[PDB]
């Protein structure tokens, strides 16, 4: 996505606008930063070579400006009812604020734009979409204290995001549906902590960088395209596909750690039924992760024989192999970590 320096300019201004959003002490400067982030994320997610990217940017524009005007209208309504930004007893205007934030984030009652837009993108604007663009709404969700909207969103996110990814054989829509399920674990962590959410979001972001770099360097967009992917040693293809088992939450790899910290903090906060509802609905996520892992866990395949050289970037794959090592051997660093406490 670095074909121009103007895209680097749009990247730093969308970083600036997101930081204006998450540091605003009022409900209107947050909307100001949301509009800055929207202005800088319209030209990214748009390109001349791909036809679907322009209508996907149209879908993003209509979804975000529908969500931002409802966010502005409800914040002005809250300010008209009580003139401070906070609220003593929570009421329906906070529900409209949280629903407008859930349309921005992509919770499962309002998530239907997310994989339908994801069906026509590249793998770097998807990396910006499921990681950085989830910063601006989710950090405003932590300011509200209503429980049942978060409960409905978490439950609907972990059933709908896990079941709906089974039919999808495109890798982008499957990763969007997997990010919808990993969104629900972040909102379940938001009801109990503002630090365990940062733990889950940072390592989910880390897993998103290391897993979307596999599909961006080698240009993989399909489940059948993974079977035809040529790696010179099949042990390396087997080892590189352990990031799916890592992100699915398996104990020897990293990615078990943030889910485990969410489990540890939720049980200490006496919330057991919602945890069971999420973890019976996270096995389906590992099922469509293991359906990807059909293409590497067996050691020999009926490969197409016209391609015999593996072509790859140098700097991007050099950054990829550092993060693949810490995705599967990163549980040795739990003794050095001190940010859980």
């Amino acid at each position: 996505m670095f074909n121009n320096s103007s895209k680097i300019l749009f990247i730093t201004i969308m970083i600036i606008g997101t930081l204006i959003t998450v540091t605003s002490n009022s409900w209107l400067g947050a909307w100001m930063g949301l509009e800055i982030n929207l202005l800088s994320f319209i030209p990214l997610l748009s390109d001349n070579n791909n036809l679907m990217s322009t209508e996907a940017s149209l879908k993003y524009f209509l979804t975000q400006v529908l969500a931002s005007t409802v966010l502005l209208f409800s914040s002005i309504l809250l300010m008209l009812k009580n003139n401070m930004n906070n609220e003593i007893n929570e009421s329906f205007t906070s529900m409209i604020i949280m629903s407008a934030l859930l349309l921005k984030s992509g919770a499962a009652p309002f998530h239907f734009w997310f994989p339908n837009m994801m069906e026509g993108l590249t793998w770097m604007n998807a990396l910006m979409l499921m990681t950085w663009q989830k910063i601006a709404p989710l950090m405003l969700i932590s300011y509200l204290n209503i429980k049942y909207l978060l409960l409905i969103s978490v439950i609907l996110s972990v059933i709908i995001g896990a079941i709906g990814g089974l039919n999808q054989t495109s890798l982008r829509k499957l990763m969007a549906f997997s990010s919808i399920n990993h969104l629900g674990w972040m909102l379940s962590s938001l009801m109990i902590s503002e630090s365990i959410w940062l733990i889950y979001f940072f390592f989910y972001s880390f897993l998103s960088f290391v897993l979307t770099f596999m599909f961006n360097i080698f240009k993989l967009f399909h489940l059948n395209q993974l079977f035809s992917w040529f790696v010179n040693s099949k042990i390396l293809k087997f080892t590189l596909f352990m990031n799916f088992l890592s992100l699915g939450g398996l104990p020897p790899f990293l990615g078990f750690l943030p889910k485990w910290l969410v489990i540890q903090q939720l049980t200490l906060c006496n919330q057991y039924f919602m945890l069971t509802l999420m973890m019976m609905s996270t096995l389906i996520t590992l099922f469509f992760y293991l359906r990807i892992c059909y293409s590497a866990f067996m050691m020999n395949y009926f490969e197409n024989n016209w391609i015999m050289k593996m072509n790859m970037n140098s700097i991007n794959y050099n950054m990829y192999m550092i993060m693949t090592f810490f995705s599967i051997f990163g549980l040795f660093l739990i003794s050095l970590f001190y940010f859980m406490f």
């Binding site: 121009n4 103007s6 240009k219 399909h222 020999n300 790859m312 700097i315």
Partner: protein
């Protein structure tokens, strides 16, 4: 385009030639080093197409030495079967299974009906597509124009030529059409196309005059295959490429003269197509801004692994292009335990490489 005879000497570059085979060209290299500062009238891509017996290497060599350009030779399958260290992988044929053995154009000349031939043409496309980008990296980064004996735009003519004689199935046509529809829209069309016209009998006469030991006593070059390809050139490939590239028909049934076609090239005005913005001719090279020029240079000097990873189409419904898994395993155990390709090129200590303990230089656009 101006020749050496009218100019009175060699051409001068407008800027320093960028070492595109050593230094990468990212956006942080594109901030400082501009790419439209070294372009002139001799920065065109010329493809010299024709039948299989027409003299095109000699003509492209004298056109490159006359118009001050670089001659890119025709691709052959020695580029895969001989590695960077010079070892020939045709000597691994008894170790390889018979469904995964070597298949050069010599094996096509004696045995055109083999199942590997449907792979072979695709491999030829993977050497034309890999050459043209290597041509484009010479145009955008150094400013010197290139001349090509063969182009990937004209490789489908040979595909339907082996299809019409019966050497390919319908599935081989389908997978080559899928690969072409996946890949041909990512590389810029040439500026100028020269077709060295030959009749079907003179092609056979030049084939028996060349006396190459596999062209003679081969049933491939019959009166139907050559006629099919010369018909198919002039009514598919030339008609497709004339919308963008200038098309020059030259009666090459004689020995052919070089000064007359340089004269015919030099009277072509190249600036009249840039007056109309939405003109079909030279549309792919019409970049109105320097940022679009640098994006076009980045697309071929830095994003060549993307265009080489665009050949990753899965099509398992054909039985003659699917390598079986035990054969693929023993093919890996033979091919990647060779003296040439045990490691990446430049890092194999078995074939005379030293200083590997302090060497961390990978290389640019290197096949692994």
């Amino acid at each position: 385009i101006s020749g050496k005879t009218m100019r009175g000497g060699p051409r001068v570059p407008k800027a320093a030639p960028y070492p595109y085979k050593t230094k990468k060209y990212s956006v942080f290299n594109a901030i400082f080093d501009k790419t439209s500062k070294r372009f002139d009238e001799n920065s065109k891509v010329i493809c010299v197409e024709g039948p299989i017996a027409a003299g095109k290497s000699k003509f492209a060599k004298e056109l490159a030495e006359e118009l001050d350009m670089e001659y890119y030779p025709a691709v052959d399958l020695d580029l895969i079967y001989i590695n960077s260290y010079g070892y020939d992988m045709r000597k691994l044929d008894p170790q390889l299974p018979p469904s995964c053995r070597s298949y050069d154009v010599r094996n096509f000349c004696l045995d055109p009906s083999h199942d590997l031939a449907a792979q072979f043409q695709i491999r030829m496309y993977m050497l034309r597509y890999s050459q043209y980008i290597d041509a484009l990296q010479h145009v955008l980064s150094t400013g010197q124009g290139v001349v090509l004996e063969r182009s990937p735009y004209s490789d489908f003519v040979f595909m339907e030529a082996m299809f019409r004689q019966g050497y390919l199935s319908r599935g081989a046509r389908s997978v080559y059409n899928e690969l072409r529809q996946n890949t041909i829209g990512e590389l810029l069309k040439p500026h100028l196309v020269i077709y060295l016209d030959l009749p079907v009998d003179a092609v056979k006469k030049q084939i028996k005059a060349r006396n190459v030991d596999y062209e003679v006593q081969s049933k491939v070059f019959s009166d139907a295959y050559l006629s099919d390809l010369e018909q198919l050139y002039k009514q598919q490939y030339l008609k497709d490429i004339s919308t963008h590239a200038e098309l020059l028909i030259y009666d090459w049934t004689a020995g052919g003269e070089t000064e007359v076609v340089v004269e015919d090239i030099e009277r072509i005005d190249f600036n009249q197509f840039e007056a109309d913005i939405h003109n079909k001719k030279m549309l792919d090279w019409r970049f109105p801004l320097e940022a679009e020029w640098c994006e076009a240079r980045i697309k071929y000097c830095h994003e060549k692994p993307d265009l080489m990873n665009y050949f990753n189409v899965p099509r398992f419904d054909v039985p003659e292009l699917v390598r079986s898994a035990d054969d693929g395993k023993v093919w890996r155990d033979v091919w990647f335990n060779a003296p040439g390709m045990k490691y990446r090129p430049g890092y194999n200590a078995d074939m005379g490489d030293e200083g590997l303990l302090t060497k961390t230089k990978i290389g640019i656009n290197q096949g692994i």
